[PDB]
Amino acid sequence: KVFGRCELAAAMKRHGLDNYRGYSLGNWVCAAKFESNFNTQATNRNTDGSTDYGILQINSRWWCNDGRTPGSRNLCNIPCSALLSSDITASVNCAKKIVSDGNGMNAWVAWRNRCKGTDVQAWIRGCRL
Protein backbone atom coordinates (compact mmCIF):
# COMPACT_ATOMS: atom_id res chain seq x y z
CA LYS A 1 0.00 0.00 0.00
CA VAL A 2 1.17 3.48 -0.78
CA PHE A 3 -0.14 5.76 1.94
CA GLY A 4 -1.13 9.29 1.61
CA ARG A 5 0.74 11.67 3.93
CA CYS A 6 -2.14 12.28 6.34
CA GLU A 7 -3.42 8.74 6.14
CA LEU A 8 0.04 7.60 7.31
CA ALA A 9 0.18 10.23 9.99
CA ALA A 10 -3.16 8.88 11.35
CA ALA A 11 -2.06 5.31 11.24
CA MET A 12 1.20 6.22 12.98
CA LYS A 13 -0.68 8.19 15.66
CA ARG A 14 -3.07 5.44 16.30
CA HIS A 15 -0.24 2.94 16.71
CA GLY A 16 1.48 5.20 19.24
CA LEU A 17 4.34 6.91 17.44
CA ASP A 18 3.43 10.45 18.16
CA ASN A 19 6.04 11.71 20.61
CA TYR A 20 7.42 8.11 21.05
CA ARG A 21 10.81 8.59 22.65
CA GLY A 22 10.26 12.23 22.22
CA TYR A 23 9.93 12.20 18.41
CA SER A 24 6.88 14.16 17.29
CA LEU A 25 4.69 12.53 14.69
CA GLY A 26 6.14 14.72 11.84
CA ASN A 27 9.57 13.08 12.33
CA TRP A 28 8.04 9.60 11.69
CA VAL A 29 6.04 10.72 8.61
CA CYS A 30 9.10 12.51 7.26
CA ALA A 31 11.21 9.42 7.80
CA ALA A 32 8.69 7.27 6.03
CA LYS A 33 8.50 9.64 3.10
CA PHE A 34 12.20 9.62 2.45
CA GLU A 35 12.85 5.95 3.42
CA SER A 36 10.03 4.37 1.30
CA ASN A 37 7.98 7.14 -0.43
CA PHE A 38 5.17 5.96 1.92
CA ASN A 39 5.17 2.51 0.27
CA THR A 40 4.70 -0.42 2.61
CA GLN A 41 6.16 -2.76 -0.07
CA ALA A 42 9.48 -1.00 -0.48
CA THR A 43 12.60 -3.19 -0.30
CA ASN A 44 16.27 -2.08 -0.84
CA ARG A 45 19.32 -4.45 -0.58
CA ASN A 46 22.37 -3.18 1.25
CA THR A 47 26.01 -3.78 0.39
CA ASP A 48 26.49 -6.10 3.42
CA GLY A 49 23.75 -8.42 2.01
CA SER A 50 21.02 -7.28 4.42
CA THR A 51 17.83 -5.71 3.03
CA ASP A 52 15.66 -2.90 4.29
CA TYR A 53 11.88 -3.50 4.39
CA GLY A 54 8.70 -1.51 4.51
CA ILE A 55 7.50 1.94 5.15
CA LEU A 56 10.40 2.61 7.55
CA GLN A 57 13.00 0.53 5.71
CA ILE A 58 13.78 -1.72 8.72
CA ASN A 59 17.01 -3.76 8.20
CA SER A 60 17.38 -7.52 8.32
CA ARG A 61 20.89 -7.32 9.85
CA TRP A 62 19.36 -6.64 13.23
CA TRP A 63 15.66 -6.40 13.29
CA CYS A 64 13.77 -9.00 11.21
CA ASN A 65 14.44 -12.37 9.69
CA ASP A 66 14.55 -12.68 5.86
CA GLY A 67 16.33 -16.01 5.65
CA ARG A 68 19.21 -14.59 3.62
CA THR A 69 21.23 -12.36 5.95
CA PRO A 70 23.66 -14.76 7.62
CA GLY A 71 24.65 -14.16 11.16
CA SER A 72 22.07 -11.46 11.56
CA ARG A 73 19.67 -10.91 14.39
CA ASN A 74 15.91 -10.68 14.59
CA LEU A 75 15.31 -8.35 17.45
CA CYS A 76 11.78 -7.57 16.51
CA ASN A 77 10.99 -11.29 16.31
CA ILE A 78 9.29 -11.00 12.96
CA PRO A 79 9.76 -12.14 9.39
CA CYS A 80 10.82 -9.13 7.33
CA SER A 81 7.84 -9.80 5.11
CA ALA A 82 5.67 -8.68 7.97
CA LEU A 83 7.06 -5.23 7.47
CA LEU A 84 5.64 -5.07 3.96
CA SER A 85 2.01 -5.45 4.95
CA SER A 86 -0.57 -2.71 4.23
CA ASP A 87 -1.16 -2.84 8.02
CA ILE A 88 1.76 -0.93 9.55
CA THR A 89 1.43 -2.47 13.04
CA ALA A 90 4.53 -4.64 12.66
CA SER A 91 6.58 -1.84 11.24
CA VAL A 92 5.57 0.57 14.00
CA ASN A 93 6.19 -1.94 16.76
CA CYS A 94 9.61 -2.68 15.37
CA ALA A 95 10.39 1.04 14.90
CA LYS A 96 9.66 1.56 18.59
CA LYS A 97 12.34 -1.00 19.42
CA ILE A 98 14.79 0.60 17.07
CA VAL A 99 14.37 4.12 18.29
CA SER A 100 14.76 2.84 21.89
CA ASP A 101 18.16 1.16 21.13
CA GLY A 102 20.41 4.21 21.97
CA ASN A 103 20.72 6.11 18.68
CA GLY A 104 17.22 7.39 18.50
CA MET A 105 15.98 8.16 14.96
CA ASN A 106 19.56 8.36 13.71
CA ALA A 107 18.96 4.68 12.95
CA TRP A 108 17.16 5.94 9.84
CA VAL A 109 19.66 7.49 7.43
CA ALA A 110 16.95 9.36 5.55
CA TRP A 111 15.67 10.81 8.82
CA ARG A 112 19.14 12.04 9.79
CA ASN A 113 19.80 13.50 6.38
CA ARG A 114 16.44 14.89 5.44
CA CYS A 115 14.30 15.32 8.55
CA LYS A 116 16.54 15.96 11.54
CA GLY A 117 16.76 19.65 12.24
CA THR A 118 14.05 20.51 9.73
CA ASP A 119 10.52 21.74 10.23
CA VAL A 120 9.00 18.28 10.53
CA GLN A 121 5.57 19.54 11.72
CA ALA A 122 5.09 20.36 8.02
CA TRP A 123 4.51 16.66 7.46
CA ILE A 124 1.41 16.61 9.59
CA ARG A 125 0.03 20.01 8.50
CA GLY A 126 -3.52 19.86 7.38
CA CYS A 127 -4.16 16.49 8.82
CA ARG A 128 -7.14 15.58 10.97
CA LEU A 129 -5.46 14.10 14.01
Annotated binding site for substrate: which residue ranges? 101
Cα pseudo-dihedral 107, 111, 114, 120, rounded to 10: -150
Q: Please list, in sequence order, all residues whose beta carbon lies within 8 angstroms of the beta carbon of residue 14, skipping any fewer than 6 positions away.
A: none
Rule CB under 5 A: is residue 24 a binding residue for Na ion?
no
User: Treating both helix axes as pointing N-terminal to C-terminal, what angle do 25-36 and 5-14 enclose, rounded to 10 degrees?
Assistant: 130
Cβ contacts of residue 25 below 8 Å, gap of 6+? 9, 12, 13, 17, 18, 19, 123, 124, 129
- 72 interacts with Na ion by CB under 5 A: yes
Element at 110 (helix H, strand E): helix 109-114
Catalytic: 35? yes
**Residues 41-80: x where in contact with Cl ion by CB under 5 A, - otherwise, as a string:** ---------xx--------x-----x-xx-----------
Q: Which of Cl ion, Na ion, none interacts with 93 (beta carbon under 5 to 8 A by kind)?
A: none
**Cβ 94 to Cl ion shortest distance, Å:** 14
37 binds Cl ion (CB under 5 A): no
Decide: is 93 part of the binding site for Cl ion (CB under 5 A). Answer: no
74, interface contact from Cl ion, Na ion, none, CB < 5-8 Å by kind: Na ion
The residues binding Na ion (CB under 5 A) are 60, 65, 69, 72, 74
